[PDB]
Amino acid sequence: VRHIAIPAHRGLITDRNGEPLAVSTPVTTLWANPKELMTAKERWPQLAAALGQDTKLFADRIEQNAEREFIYLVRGLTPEQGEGVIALKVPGVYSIEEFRRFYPAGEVVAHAVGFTDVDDRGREGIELAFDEWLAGVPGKRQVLKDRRGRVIKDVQVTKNAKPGKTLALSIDLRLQYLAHRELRNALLENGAKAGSLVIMDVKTGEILAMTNQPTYNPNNRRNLQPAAMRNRAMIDVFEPGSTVKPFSMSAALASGRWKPSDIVDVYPGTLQIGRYTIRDVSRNSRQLDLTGILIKSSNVGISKIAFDIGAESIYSVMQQVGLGQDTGLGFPGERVGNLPNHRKWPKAETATLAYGYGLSVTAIQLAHAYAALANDGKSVPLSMTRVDRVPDGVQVISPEVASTVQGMLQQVVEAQGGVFRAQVPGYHAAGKSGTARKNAYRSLFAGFAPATDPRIAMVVVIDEPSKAGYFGGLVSAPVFSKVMAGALRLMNVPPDNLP
Numbered sequence: 021v022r023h024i025a026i027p028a029h030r031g032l033i034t035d036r037n038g039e040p041l042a043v044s045t046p047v048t049t050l051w052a053n054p055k056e057l058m059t060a061k062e063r064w065p066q067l068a069a070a071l072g073q074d075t076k077l078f079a080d081r082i083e084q085n086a087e088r089e090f091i092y093l094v095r096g097l098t099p100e101q102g103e104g105v106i107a108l109k110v111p112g113v114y115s116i117e118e119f120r121r122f123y124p125a126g127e128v129v130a131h132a133v134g135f136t137d138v139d140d141r142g143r144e145g146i147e148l149a150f151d152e153w154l155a156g157v158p159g160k161r162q163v164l165k166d167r168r169g170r171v172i173k174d175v176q177v178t179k180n181a182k183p184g185k186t187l188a189l190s191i192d193l194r195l196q197y198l199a200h201r202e203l204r205n206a207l208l209e210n211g212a213k214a215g216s217l218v219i220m221d222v223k224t225g226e227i228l229a230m231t232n233q234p235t236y237n238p239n240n241r242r243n244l245q246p247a248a249m250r251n252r253a254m255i256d257v258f259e260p261g262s263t264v265k266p267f268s269m270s271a272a273l274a275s276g277r278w279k280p281s282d283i284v285d286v287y288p289g290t291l292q293i294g295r296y297t298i299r300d301v302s303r304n305s306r307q308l309d310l311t312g313i314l315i316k317s318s319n320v321g322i323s324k325i326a327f328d329i330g331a332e333s334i335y336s337v338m339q340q341v342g343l344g345q346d347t348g349l350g351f352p353g354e355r356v357g358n359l360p361n362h363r364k365w366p367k368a369e370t371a372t373l374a375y376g377y378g379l380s381v382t383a384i385q386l387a388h389a390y391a392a393l394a395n396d397g398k399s400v401p402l403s404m405t406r407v408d409r410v411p412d413g414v415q416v417i418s419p420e421v422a423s424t425v426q427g428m429l430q431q432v433v434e435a436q437g438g439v440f441r442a443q444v445p446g447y448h449a450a451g452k453s454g455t456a457r458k459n460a461y462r463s464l465f466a467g468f469a470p471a472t473d474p475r476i477a478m479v480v481v482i483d484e485p486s487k488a489g490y491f492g493g494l495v496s497a498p499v500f501s502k503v504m505a506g507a508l509r510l511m512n513v514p515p516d517n518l519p
């Protein structure tokens with residue numbers, strides 16, 4: 021190299037409405053030529069003190085690099101801080117105009133946006149995922165230096181730096197601040213270890229919000245534990261439990277063998293399958309209709325329906341909605357989980373599959389699956405970027421079966437003995453709670469609203485609640501309520517629970 025790199029301007033990242041999320045800010049990097057510094061030793065303590073370096077340790081560094089023509093002194097100073105060191109007129113001290121990322125929303129979109137390294141290269145999240153679009157191409161400038169390495173002049177701009185391109189994400193910052201605030205509050209209120217909240221636009225496949233606890237400030241790195249950096253909604257796999265019962269119910273209704281008014285005997289609240297024992301949470305029931313199986317969240321009831329229709333029909337619905345399937349988002353470190361398949365399904369595996377014990381999914385996958393159901397059984401491909409021209413979508417559940425299932429889920433929320441904490445002020449909502457044993461628990465709520473013209477699907481995951489309450493309908497459902505209520509207002513969704 022007789023040339024020095026011209027860092028290009030990194031692409032602006034914004035939310036869906038142009039709110040900046042990642043801003044390339046001008047910084048100044050100082051470098052020095054030790055062969056020039058070696059003839060100006062009486063200036064070193066002044067230069068050391070301006071750099072925040074120890075006098076002797078700085079002098080040692082120069083003396084050791086004496087034959088080298090380039091050393092970095094300090095990186096990423098404000099243009100003002102850098103201009104101050106240049107003003108000392110220390111022979112052989114030079115500056116390079118660089119760029120450093122600033123994240124205006126900080127810890128609020130840390131996991132989605134990600135961050136760049138010291139070299140301004142995308143290391144996590146969107147920054148990495150879209151690195152090629154955002155980076156552009158670094159320029160080149162030919163220099164003239166005497167034999168001592170002293171930079172005389174810039175000969176030419178060999179290759180002009182081409183700046184990065186802007187990126188508008190699908191994230192609505194208002195919804196993102198709202199989900200972030202409320203998930204933080206739920207974590208603190210319950211003494212919970214971690215959590216995730218995902219908001220989906222059921223019509224466009226857009227991820228409107230994706231927040232996780234714990235989080236970190238991407239602007240102030242240093243000391244950061246791995247727990248805080250984990251983009252949980254995409255990288256944490258979990259058993260979805262009772263939240264998959266709507267999909268087992270879709271298979272039952274699509275079979276031709278079941279209707280909502282159908283009865284299933286669940287007495288005495290247990291069912292033995294060889295050495296394994298299926299157990300219901302509440303065990304004071306005998307005959308339950310299909311809606312009552314979802315309200316009471318009966319594992320016995322769903323297991324018996326699964327035996328009637330066969331696991332192959334259930335697996336097919338769960339596979340089609342995307343449970344344990346690749347999202348198609350080339351998102352760094354995103355997990356696929358697992359949807360177990362069998363050549364021939366045994367009795368025990370049929371039952372555990374129908375109630376979500378036999379499977380691992382992400383909160384993104386669960387939200388996408390509820391979006392398909394909410395969107396009249398049609399699955400629109402997921403997007404982390406703003407969707408202007410919406411792709412076609414795949415019909416994964418018949419519209420009639422999807423409509424019936426939506427109605428039962430509105431009853432789960434609105435009916436006697438139902439998930440009353442998930443109710444949305446002034447709207448009809450629909451959803452299903454889940455509680456998974458990890459005793460350590462995972463508290464879930466999945467749902468959508470308005471129930472009469474769905475617009476939003478949402479998943480709330482609260483990992484390890486440490487207070488008396490651990491059930492999803494008690495821990496996660498009130499989060500869904502507050503966030504959904506706020507999001508429908510922000511999106512000008514007309515209330516459908518009109519007096």
Ligand SMILES: *C(=O)[C@@H](NC(=O)/C(=N\OC(C)(C)C(=O)O)c1csc(N)n1)[C@H](C)NS(=O)(=O)O
Pocket residue numbers: 259260261262263299300301317319375376377453454455456457458461491492493
């Ligand atoms: C569905 O989420 C249903 N969950 C279960 O039956 C599971 N365990 O239940 C509890 C937490 C009571 C237990 O300690 O046994 C379960 C499913 S997958 C898994 N790994 N554990 C709960 C009962 N329904 S909800 O609607 O009340 O949340």
